[PDB]
Design a protein around this ligand. Structure first.
Ligand SMILES: Nc1nc2c(ncn2[C@@H]2O[C@H](COP(=O)(O)OP(=O)(O)O)[C@@H](O)[C@H]2O)c(=O)[nH]1
Ligand SMILES: [N+]
Length: 173
C-alpha cells in the first residue's frame, strides 16, 4: 500500500516472476496484499497469473513443466524488463533443475537485457542454502553480461520482499 506506492510509484514496468512449483510465488503475492489476479490457460495444465498494480504488470507461472510447453513461454518475453526468479533454498535436490530453467529463460533472444532478482526463499527452513551458495549453485558467478542480485527471503513472514523489490525498481531500465 504505502510501502508499494513508495517503491513502485507511477513507474512503468513489465516483470516476470517465475520459479519451480512450491518455490513461494503465491505467498509472495499474498504478503504484498496483491490478492487479485487474472488467470490465462494457453494450453491445458499451463496456468498464467497476471497481476496489475498501477503501471506495473506481473506475469507469473511455474517452470519445470513438460518440454513441449517451453515454446509457449516466449509469448511473454517481449518488453520484459525484470525477471524475478524465486528459489526454495531448502530443496537441495531441485537446485540443479532450477539452474537449468533459469539459464534457459535468460538465454532466449528476447530476454538478453532483463536484470535478474533472485528471491533465495525459505531461509527459515532447516539447512536452507544461503544467498552466497545460491549465487554459485545457480551459475550466477559466471554471468558477466548483465546485472543480477540475490535477496534472502522468508515469504511467510515478509522478510526480504520489500528490499528485493527496491533493488529491482532502482536497477531496471
Ligand atoms: N517455511 C517457509 N515456507 C514457505 C516460505 N514461502 C513459502 N512457503 C511455503 O511453501 C509452500 C509453497 O508456497 P507457494 O506460494 O504455494 O509456492 P508456489 O507454488 O511457487 O506458488 C507453501 O506451503 C508456503 O507456505 C518461506 O519463506 N518459509
Ligand atoms: N504458483
Amino acid at each position: 500500500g504505502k510501502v508499494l506506492s513508495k517503491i513502485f510509484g507511477n513507474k512503468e514496468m513489465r516483470i516476470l516472476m517465475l520459479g519451480l512449483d512450491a518455490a513461494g510465488k503465491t505467498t509472495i503475492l499474498y504478503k504484498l496484499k496483491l490478492g487479485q489476479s487474472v488467470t490465462t490457460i494457453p494450453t491445458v495444465g499451463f496456468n498464467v497469473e497476471t497481476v496489475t498494480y498501477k503501471n506495473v504488470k506481473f506475469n507469473v507461472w511455474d517452470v519445470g513443466g513438460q518440454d513441449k510447453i517451453r515454446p509457449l513461454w516466449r509469448h511473454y518475453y517481449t518488453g520484459t524488463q525484470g525477471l524475478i526468479f524465486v528459489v526454495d533454498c531448502a530443496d537441495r535436490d531441485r537446485i540443479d533443475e532450477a539452474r537449468q530453467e533459469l539459464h534457459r529463460i535468460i538465454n532466449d533472444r528476447e530476454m538478453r537485457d532483463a536484470i535478474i532478482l533472485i528471491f533465495a526463499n525459505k531461509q527459515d527452513l532447516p539447512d536452507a542454502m544461503k544467498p552466497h551458495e545460491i549465487q554459485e549453485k545457480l551459475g550466477l558467478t559466471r554471468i558477466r553480461d548483465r546485472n543480477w542480485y540475490v535477496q534472502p527471503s522468508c515469504a511467510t513472514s515478509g522478510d526480504g520482499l520489500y528490499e528485493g523489490l527496491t533493488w529491482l525498481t532502482s536497477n531496471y531500465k
